[PDB]
Design a protein around this ligand. Structure first.
Ligand SMILES: O=P(O)(O)O[C@H]1[C@H](OP(=O)(O)O)[C@@H](OP(=O)(O)O)[C@H](OP(=O)(O)O)[C@@H](OP(=O)(O)O)[C@H]1OP(=O)(O)O
Ligand SMILES: Nc1nc2c(ncn2[C@@H]2O[C@H](COP(=O)(O)OP(=O)(O)OP(=O)(O)O)[C@@H](O)[C@H]2O)c(=O)[nH]1
Ligand SMILES: [Mg+2]
Ligand SMILES: [Mg+2]
Ligand SMILES: [Mg+2]
Ligand SMILES: [Zn+2]
Lengths: 241, 81, 96, 22, 352, 96, 82
RNA sequence: AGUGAUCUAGAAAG
RNA sequence: AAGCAGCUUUACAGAUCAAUGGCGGAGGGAGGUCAACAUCAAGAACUGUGGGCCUUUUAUUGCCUAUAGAACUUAUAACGAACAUGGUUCUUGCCUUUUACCAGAAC
């Protein structure tokens, strides 16, 4: 499946598990230890998914975007994806900055790459009053991740980097969230996603780099992209609450 | 665990749980009774042959067969002794 | 493999489903003075026939036994080999 | 053994760098 | 289980344990699943796989000694010819006396005397009453015929070495020495355990051996992978390949061979894994082949490891002693001293 | 309600016994006649298709079978009607 | 065609024949042929004179049969379906 | 004479 | 299988151009990254309806029997060939405390 068919239903792009068929099969015996343990760990994730099905409920009528669409306050249009990303970046920056300023913490500054830095060395009363929690920080770091992705697409559209560099850049970001983003500090369970991305990188590279050798250029970013989307699935209700 | 070797889990062991096989690893009296049995077997062998012939190809009466069968042994027992 | 806490190499590993162990057990039933050893019972056997080769197979699921042996011949050559042909792998048919 | 897709030795069909051809 | 599974044999030992016999590993897996999941619904311990052994002879009894509990019985044992074993295995010869004696005289080449003196065929063994008329007239032994045959049946259903069945033995009566005095109805009770003991003595005097059932194996494998299959058949003990069929019009070979049942544990799994799923095999016992285990059962000092599988020359001793300890019969093992007088035993040991 | 999913797929309700294409009483009406009954044993080696051969004969005899999924109507998967024990369904094998 | 098939689908049941000669026979139909030859067993028989007898087993040539009576059950046999 | 079995991982407040 | 006779008839031409019956016509088709409502894990497990049935009159439900139609989902059992998070309890791990966590189970 699916090649023995000639008709079917469309699936979501994130539902095409391209890399999955590799680690359901035996790895090539010559591979080094890190690749083999990567295969083994991805199999662990697959088996634990198959053991414990979380079946959906049928009375799930009030989807968010449809419910908002019924209102006079929300309107439709169509825009380019890079414009939508830039808009969402500006919007999220405005939201977090307004939250900072309503709480009176103008002595904290939010960068346009979503780092939060104090403008001055803070008093103890200022430190207690400005002690933002994991909700704010998780929100901030997700905006930071999205900002990185959008900025690579912006670089491509300015002509600064070509398409292959873009593919490699997206792949690098999704593999190196652990270094670029710091999101684990506020939700340490994301290390499962980071570990899954590392394992995926190992198996992808040792399929990809056969007879090529070392260096950048591998832009097959679809599996890690799926990892982070499926993380966002379960992060939506938590961050909403 | 594999083939009965190794930890329940690597978790909590402070080790990787890696396992590797160690390459460093004159006759007695009762014996004569068969010899006695053979000589008395011989008599019954010839009796059996004669009795089978009498039954199958010479006569129809049990008493006629039996006396002629016994005639062989009556002579052979002294013939060997 | 998870339920029995047995792992063939290459396969995943999990912490045991039943973390207890019958340390109270001492009985003669499987004493080495009574067991006939001829072949070591691999973990592969313990997952192939889980109810035969395990003493307490709690929560195991029965595996699919077998499929008929695959004989799907593939056409290697680009153009010169047609769809239907007697592949070199096949034994001949000498009967007449 | 050679790659039937391009004729070069060593690598398999699945690991070829030239595009597939019929 | 005994009702629903037609081919399964269930019996209970004097040890208090239950013994199940089945056709093979998948069969046992299925019925043990049924026990745990539908019918018993309790947790059940089980041994590693075993096999049904049987006990037999390799020579005629070195002495036809008398055996006594004043009544006495003497018997001797001798192996049945291979032709008769292979025919009687299939419940065929060549129960009317003249017909049976005809074919025994003809095809199996018996003496007419023994041919007419057959007294029972039972589970691959034969009892022959060659008792001479000089001590006991035919009429007097005829009074006891049914019950002495019952004793012989007890004897062949459980043997002296391991209480396993006897197979492939001719049992020959020398004499049953009967008192003139006692009422026969009580003497019925006395003769069946003494006939059991007499057959035990007769077999132990007959250079006893242990017999092992042999699976025949049919293996279907892709032809270029035959080296792996024959390597596996070399790794397993006692297994041999007899014929290879080139399956016409396919890439497959059908490979016919044999492997002992005790050696058969996980054979299918090893073959399927080594061949990467391009091979499969079937194990069956409809041709009922029984074969001598190597070594001598009466070898007291053979080397038997604690955990490794034992070497070849000690296999029979290892099987017999492990069966004896599991059944609770037992470190000395079987010997005639269990059954015969001490003076006779020591004299036999000295005389050899 | 008595439930049998733990052991076998089986029809407990008489209203759901499938309707034959032929009149079933007519079949009983000739059970009185020994010349009209044949008993057929479908034997053969492992995975020969015996249960599938039976699946052919069952489907052609009945109007609608409740256990038919669209995967079976379209022939992606065999019906395996007579392999109805849970253990047989799991092993992919006729056992009883 | 259907009538010869119905006479084959009648085998094993009790049928009643009437002949051109005016005789009547009633009994279990052991075998029937495409030519309408029939064999009957445990046969009640009747003469043209109306005299009645019994006989073990009979064969009848097809040409001489006037009509055959078949058990009413067969009206719902699968033979008649479209 | 050599088959394999490979835990981890960091931030806040106190 | 075509040459001829029967069924079907329709591009037609008729008797009829009346009395009939047959099939259509008395608010069209294809689509939508539109919406609402109903429904989707159960004796292998479906609803309506005619006759009979325990609730003291069997009502509408549960039972027997006759009969018409079942869309989607499912047997290497699931809407989804995909795969997240959270709560409670228990047992572990790291462990100076809580959050954040290690990873198995059950709900
Ligand atoms: O730590 P890993 O996950 O294994 O990945 C490491 C690198 O990632 P970073 O540490 O973030 O730089 C990676 O380059 P990148 O992904 O950044 O492009 C290299 O790939 P390549 O050189 O481009 O082929 C790997 O080399 P291989 O060993 O051949 O896989 C390297 O492994 P190593 O640390 O054992 O040397
Ligand atoms: N290619 C092919 N496969 C078939 C055919 N018939 C059955 N199979 C497959 O063979 C396998 C065995 O199917 P079964 O119908 O259970 O065969 P069986 O003879 O009943 O085997 P047992 O269960 O051992 O009795 C299944 O995977 C079927 O899909 C066939 O005609 N062609
Ligand atoms: Mg079958
Ligand atoms: Mg304090
Ligand atoms: Mg405190
Ligand atoms: Zn190539």
């Amino acid at each position: 499946f699916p090649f023995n068919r000639t008709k079917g239903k469309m699936v979501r792009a994130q539902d095409v598990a391209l890399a999955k068929k590799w680690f359901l099969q035996h790895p090539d015996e010559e591979y080094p230890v890190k690749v083999k343990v990567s295969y083994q760990k991805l199999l662990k994730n697959y088996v634990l998914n198959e053991l414990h099905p979380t079946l959906p409920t049928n009375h799930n009528k009030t989807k968010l975007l449809k419910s908002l669409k019924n209102t006079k306050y929300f309107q439709q249009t169509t825009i380019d994806w890079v414009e939508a990303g830039l808009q969402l970046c500006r919007q999220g920056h405005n939201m977090l900055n307004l939250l900072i300023h309503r709480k009176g913490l103008t002595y904290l500054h939010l960068d346009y790459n979503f780092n939060l830095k104090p403008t001055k060395t803070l008093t103890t009363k200022e430190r207690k009053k400005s002690r933002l929690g994991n909700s704010f920080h998780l929100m901030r770091e997700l905006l930071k991740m999205m900002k990185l992705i959008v900025d690579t697409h912006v670089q491509f559209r300015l002509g600064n980097v070509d398409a292959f560099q873009l593919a490699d850049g997206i792949h690098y970001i999704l593999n190196h969230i652990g270094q670029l983003t710091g999101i684990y500090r506020y939700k340490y369970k994301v290390m499962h996603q980071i570990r899954a991305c590392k394992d995926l990188k190992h198996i992808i590279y040792y399929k990809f780099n056969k007879n090529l050798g070392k260096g950048p250029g591998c832009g097959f970013w679809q599996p890690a992209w799926r990892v982070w989307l499926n993380f966002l699935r379960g992060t939506i209700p938590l961050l909403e609450r | 665990s594999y083939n009965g070797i190794g930890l329940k889990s690597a978790k909590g062991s402070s080790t990787s749980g890696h396992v590797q096989r160690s390459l460093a690893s004159r006759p007695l009296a009762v014996q004569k009774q068969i010899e006695t049995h053979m000589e008395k077997r011989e008599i019954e062998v010839q009796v059996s042959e004669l009795r089978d012939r009498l039954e199958e190809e010479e006569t129809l009466s049990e008493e006629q067969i039996d006396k002629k069968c016994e005639a062989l042994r009556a002579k052979l027992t002294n013939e060997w002794q | 493999g998870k339920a029995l806490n047995n792992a063939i190499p290459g396969g995943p590993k999990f912490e045991p489903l039943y973390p207890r162990e019958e340390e109270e057990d001492y009985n003669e039933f499987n004493s080495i003075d009574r067991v006939i050893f001829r072949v070591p019972i691999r973990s592969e056997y313990k997952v192939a026939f889980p109810h035969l080769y395990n003493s307490r197979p709690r929560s195991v699921r029965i595996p699919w036994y077998n499929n008929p042996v695959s004989c799907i011949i593939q056409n290697d050559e680009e153009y010169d080999t047609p769809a239907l042909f007697f592949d070199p792998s096949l034994n001949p048919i000498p009967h007449f | 053994s050679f790659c039937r897709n391009c004729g070069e030795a060593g690598h398999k069909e699945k690991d070829c760098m030239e595009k597939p051809r019929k | 289980i005994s009702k629903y599974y037609p081919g399964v044999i269930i019996k209970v030992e004097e040890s208090g344990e239950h013994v199940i016999l089945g056709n093979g590993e998948l069969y046992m897996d299925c019925l043990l699943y049924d026990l745990r999941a539908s019918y018993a619904k309790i947790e059940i311990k089980i041994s590693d796989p075993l096999t049904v052994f049987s006990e037999s002879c390799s020579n005629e009894s070195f002495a036809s000694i008398p055996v006594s509990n004043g009544l006495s019985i003497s018997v001797a044992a001798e192996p049945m010819d291979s032709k008769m074993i292979q025919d009687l295995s299939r419940n065929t010869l060549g129960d009317n006396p003249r017909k049976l004696s005809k074919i025994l005289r003809t095809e199996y080449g018996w003496d007419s005397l023994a041919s007419r003196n057959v007294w029972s065929f039972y589970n691959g063994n034969v009892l022959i009453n060659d008792t001479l008329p000089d001590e006991i007239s035919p009429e007097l032994l005829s009074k006891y015929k049914e019950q002495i045959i019952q004793g012989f049946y007890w004897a062949v259903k459980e043997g002296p070495l391991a209480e396993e069945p006897i197979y492939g033995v001719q049992y020959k009566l020398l004499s049953i020495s009967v008192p003139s005095d006692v009422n026969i109805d009580v003497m019925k009770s006395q003769i069946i355990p003494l006939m059991k003991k007499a057959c035990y003595v007769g077999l132990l005097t007959a250079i006893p051996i242990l017999l092992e059932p042999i699976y025949e194996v049919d293996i279907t494998v892709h032809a270029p992978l035959l080296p792996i299959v024959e390597e596996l058949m070399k790794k397993r003990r006692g297994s041999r390949i007899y014929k290879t069929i080139k399956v016409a019009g396919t890439p497959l070979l059908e490979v016919r061979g044999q492997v002992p049942v005790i050696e058969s544990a996980g054979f299918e799994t090893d073959l399927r894994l080594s061949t990467n799923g391009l091979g499969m095999c079937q194990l069956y016992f409809w041709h009922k082949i029984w074969r001598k285990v190597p070594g001598d059962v009466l070898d007291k000092d053979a080397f038997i490891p604690k955990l490794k599988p034992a070497p070849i020359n000690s296999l029979s001793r290892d099987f017999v002693m492990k069966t004896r300890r599991r059944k609770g019969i037992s470190n000395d093992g079987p010997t005639l001293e269990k059954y015969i007088s001490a003076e006779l035993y020591a004299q036999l040991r000295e005389n050899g | 309600r008595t439930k049998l999913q733990e052991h076998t797929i089986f029809t407990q309700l008489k209203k759901n016994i499938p309707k034959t294409r032929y009149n079933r009483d007519y079949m009983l009406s000739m059970a009185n006649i020994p010349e009209r009954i044949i008993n057929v044993g479908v034997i053969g080696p492992l995975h020969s298709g015996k249960t599938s051969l039976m699946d052919l004969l069952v489907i052609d005899s009945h109007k609608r079978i409740p256990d038919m999924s669209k995967n079976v109507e379209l022939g992606w998967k065999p019906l395996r009607y007579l392999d109805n024990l849970k253990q047989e369904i799991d092993r992919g094998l006729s056992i009883k | 065609g259907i009538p010869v098939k119905l006479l084959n689908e009648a085998q094993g049941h009790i049928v009643s024949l009437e002949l051109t000669t005016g005789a009547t026979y009633r009994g279990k139909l052991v075998e029937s042929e495409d030519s309408m030859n029939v064999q009957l067993r445990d046969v009640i028989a009747t003469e043209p004179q109306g005299a009645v007898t019994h006989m073990d087993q009979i064969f009848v040539r097809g040409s001489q049969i006037k009509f055959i009576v078949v058990p009413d059950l067969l009206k719902n046999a699968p033979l008649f379906k479209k």
